[PDB]
Amino acid sequence: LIKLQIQAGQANPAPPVGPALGQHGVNIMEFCKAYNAATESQRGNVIPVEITVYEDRSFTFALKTPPAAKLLLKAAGVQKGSGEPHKTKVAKVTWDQVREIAETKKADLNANDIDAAAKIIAGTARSMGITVE
């Protein structure tokens, strides 16, 4: 059930995705077939994968996307950041897909509430200083 924010330009090169193919009693590269047939055919702008195996050994995704903080990782620019909160700016983001900032996931951990976009404008953004201008 392990999600991720590790890099998405992977073709089973490394301990993140290779063992993720090589776990839980499934085929060796059958998810690798669909993954490098579908996701990085769309050039691989960051795509996590949550393990939702059925009894028939399948699990499908959506067009998975970082939130409005690091939307630039998908769309515009460099693949880096900082480590402290409220730090220096690294890049900038325009306002084309700013109704698509909410078009990936609008969930909460608790049972509490909704509107993760009105959350994400300042929630998971001030932890680093990755910017939208």
């Binding site: 996931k105 909460d108 951990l109 608790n110 049972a111 909704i114």
Partner: protein, 126 residues
């Protein structure tokens, strides 16, 4: 508790009773948001999944003056709206009585009067 902010909010939430003619009443039983995000995001078109936790459905409805009922506090009671889109959000949440499976049918605000369960299903068809 403080009745200032709470009363001036929820009295107008139940003053939208007086403007409208139809809101649907459901039950909240608590899940992930990740399974209720699809519910409120997709089939609540212009509607809500609001708690009104167990709070102010009968005391703060006196400005409507049409509060001829007792069971506004009895059990949990929700305030999902079908004023603009009547059958749409109503049956769109009633399909979650077979999809979400964390709610039942109660019945509620139809026409300002207290309708039976069988006939509120009959008008949710018709």
């Amino acid at each position: 508790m403080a009745k200032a902010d709470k009363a001036t909010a929820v009295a107008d939430i139940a003053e939208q009773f007086k403007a409208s003619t139809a809101t649907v009443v459901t039950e909240y039983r608590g899940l992930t948001v990740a399974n209720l995000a699809e519910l409120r995001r997709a089939l609540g078109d212009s509607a809500t999944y609001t708690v009104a936790k167990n709070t102010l459905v009968k005391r703060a409805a006196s400005e409507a003056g049409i509060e001829g009922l007792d069971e506004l506090f009895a059990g949990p009671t929700a305030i999902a709206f079908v004023k603009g889109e009547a059958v749409d959000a109503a049956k769109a949440i009633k399909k979650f009585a077979k999809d979400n499976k964390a709610l039942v049918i109660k019945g509620g605000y139809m026409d300002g009067k207290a309708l039976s369960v069988a006939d509120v299903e009959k008008i949710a068809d018709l």
